[PDB]
Structure formats: C-alpha cells, structure tokens
Design a protein around this ligand. Structure first.
Ligand SMILES: Nc1ncnc2c1ncn2[C@@H]1O[C@H](COP(=O)(O)OP(=O)(O)OP(=O)(O)O)[C@@H](O)[C@H]1O
Ligand SMILES: [Mg+2]
Ligand SMILES: [Mg+2]
Lengths: 334, 20
C-alpha cells in the first residue's frame, strides 16, 4: 500500500532537494558518536527546540581530494528524500566554508554492532526480527531504484523501541541498471563487486545474507586478517554453517549467499517475495513489523536524552572552519 | 572453535567502508 504514495513523495524530494535548513551555531556540540574517513558524527543539541540530534560532518577538501564528490552528493540527496520506519530521518542539512553537515535524528540505542559483539550472537528469532526490518527497508529502497551498498551492524542503530534505524547512505545511489563502483565494507561485498563485474541491487541481498549469518553466528561467514584474504573466500563462496543453525536458516543463507547472480534470492522474477515467503520467515508478520507492533527482543538502556552510554568513546577534535570558502563549485547542490 | 578464531583475529572491531 505505502509504496505507491511513497514513490511519488520520494520523487518530488529527489527532484527538488531541501537545502540550507539550519546553521552550525544553532546547535551545541556535545560529543563524538563515531568517526569516519571524511569526518565524524557528533551528538548535538538544537538550541531552540532542545532536541538532540546526530550531526554528520564531512570535510569538503578531503571529499574532493579522494574523488568522492558524487557519493557525497548522492548521500545527502537521497537521505533527505526518503521516509521509512527503519531509515534514520534527516532533519537539517547545511554547509559552511569548510564542511558539509547532515543533521539526523539521534538514535540513542547505539550500533547493532556493539550489542552483537557484547552478547556474542543473537538467537534466530532475535536475528529474524532485525532481518525482517532490513528486508522491508530494501524492498522500499529498491522500489525507488535505490541501491544501499553498505549493510553492516556498524551502520544499523537500535532505537528506543528496539527497532532498527539504518544510517550511513554514503554509497546509496539511484540507478536503473548496473553500476561499477568498488565500494562497501570488505566482509559484506558480493562476489560480483570484488570481480569488477558490474552489478545491481542483488548485492544488497547478498549483504543481507552476510548480516543474518553474522547476527546468528556471532562472526561473519568470511573472515580473515586482510581484506584480500576475505575477498578470496567470498568469490569462492564455500560457506560453512555453525551446527546450531536451523535447517531453514541454512537454506535461506545458501540462497542469499549465492555466487550466481541469476539464482540469488531477491534477484529472481518473484523479487523480495522469494525471501518473505521463505520458511525461515514463516513466523514473521510483515505488516506488524512494518507497523512496529511486534515487541522487540531487546530494549537498550537509556539514561535520558543526550545519553551516549550505548556508544564507544572517541577522541574529540575542534571543528575548524576556514575563513575562505573551499570547494564551493563542487558542492553547489548540497 | 570458529568463534575463538574470530575473536583472536584482526577484524573484530568496527569495520570501515572502502571506496573509491
Ligand atoms: N543518526 C545517528 N544516531 C546515532 N548515531 C549515529 C547516527 N548516525 C551515525 N551514527 C553513528 O556514527 C557512526 C558513523 O556514521 P556513518 O556510518 O554515517 O559514518 P561513515 O563515515 O560513513 O562510516 P563508514 O566507514 O561505515 O562509511 C555510525 O557507525 C554510528 O555509530
Ligand atoms: Mg558507517
Ligand atoms: Mg559510510
């Protein structure tokens, strides 16, 4: 139902993105929630409303130096245009002489990553609860001709109701047809990305296979010390399963972690419904998940607004803003 | 165990994305 109206709303925002909807001095910067190659994400408090937000800060010069301009513009153009129960909400965006800023709702429960490593592994119903939300999220994204391209626990945040909010649209792209960029995170890369094959949205379904495996096992299906060692294992595709995996889960994973593109679940004629109707998801009420009516297996501890106890600590750096505008032309549309 | 092998490996912490 939602999808028809949702594509029309998406397309309107896609064609005319919002721009310049706040400025830096409207926020108190509190502390760093995560660091990345082009900047960092900080907890901030909006001075007027008192609300807390997560502000992603990107260094314009570094983005240009590493030739990531298009990905960065993709990221913001797409995130401001989407709307879904399991996607982080972008509230404001702006830029100054030095930086780009994307201010999202603060998701205080922390990364799925943190909880997964602490607990060790998730039981299959727990993993299935999260997996169902990703399945629905990809159904939404793919219907908008979006590919996501960086599914991993580090990019999945747990909210106050214990549901997932997907963050990090760094590699999100609107593409009808195939695309070729080598991007993602090594453990989650589909074989066709590694082989420089050209690829499509099926790489997101492969990544879901890796995610479900990692959630249920406590370690990813292909791991080593060096990415190249991981890549060798991925293209070979000889996955082995923990003995505690159910038969249904192994069957699903064999169909998602399918090296042959044209046999992989998610990418056949029946699309997402091959996954939704798979026996492992037999107990999943897709509508109740979508409506967020299912009680979550896990609810993070929260000590108030602005509580960061579910995040690692990072060393803080001053936000530097040059008195000269950098890379103005490159980021005109941001 | 496979879990013990994973926990002793070099990639159990947050993993950065790759690009270009
Ligand atoms: N809306 C948010 N609320 C709370 N924390 C967030 C939010 N968005 C991001 N984070 C935290 O900040 C971290 C970095 O954000 P993000 O993943 O977008 O950065 P990145 O530089 O693109 O990282 P990557 O190396 O995965 O590409 C996340 O892993 C998460 O811990
Ligand atoms: Mg990330
Ligand atoms: Mg990223």
């Amino acid at each position: 139902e939602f999808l028809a109206k949702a594509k029309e709303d998406f397309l309107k925002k896609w064609e005319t993105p919002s721009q310049n909807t706040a400025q830096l001095d409207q926020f108190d910067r509190i502390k760093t929630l995560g660091t990345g190659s082009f900047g960092r994400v900080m907890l901030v408090k909006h001075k007027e409303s008192g609300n807390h937000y997560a502000m992603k800060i990107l260094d314009k010069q570094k983005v240009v130096k590493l030739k990531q301009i298009e990905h960065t513009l993709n990221e913001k153009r797409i995130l401001q245009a989407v709307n879904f129960p399991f996607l982080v909400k972008l509230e404001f965006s702006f830029k100054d002489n030095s930086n780009l800023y994307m201010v999202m709702e603060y998701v205080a429960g922390g990364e799925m990553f943190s909880h997964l490593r602490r607990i060790g592994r998730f039981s299959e119903p727990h993993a299935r609860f999260y997996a169902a939300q990703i399945v629905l999220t990809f159904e939404y994204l793919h219907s908008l001709d979006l590919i996501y391209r960086d599914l991993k626990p580090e990019n999945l945040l747990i909210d106050q109701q214990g549901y997932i909010q997907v963050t990090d649209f760094g590699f999100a792209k609107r593409v009808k047809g195939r695309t070729w960029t080598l991007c993602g995170t090594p453990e989650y890369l589909a074989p066709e990305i590694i082989l420089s094959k050209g690829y499509n949205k099926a790489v997101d379904w492969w990544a879901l296979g890796v995610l479900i495996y990692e959630m249920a096992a406590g370690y990813p299906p292909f791991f080593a010390d060096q990415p190249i060692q991981i890549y060798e294992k991925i293209v070979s595709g000889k996955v082995r399963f923990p003995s505690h995996f159910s038969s249904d889960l192994k069957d699903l994973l064999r169909n998602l972690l399918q090296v042959d593109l044209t046999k992989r679940f998610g990418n056949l004629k029946n699309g997402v419904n091959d996954i939704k109707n798979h026996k492992w998801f037999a107990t999943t009420d897709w509508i109740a998940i979508y409506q967020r009516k299912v009680e979550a297996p896990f609810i993070p501890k929260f000590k108030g607004p602005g509580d960061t106890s579910n995040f690692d600590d990072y060393e803080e750096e001053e936000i530097r803003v040059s008195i000269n505008e950098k890379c103005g032309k490159e980021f005109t549309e941001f | 165990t496979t879990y013990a092998d994973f926990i002793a490996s070099g990639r159990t912490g947050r993993r950065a994305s790759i690009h270009d």
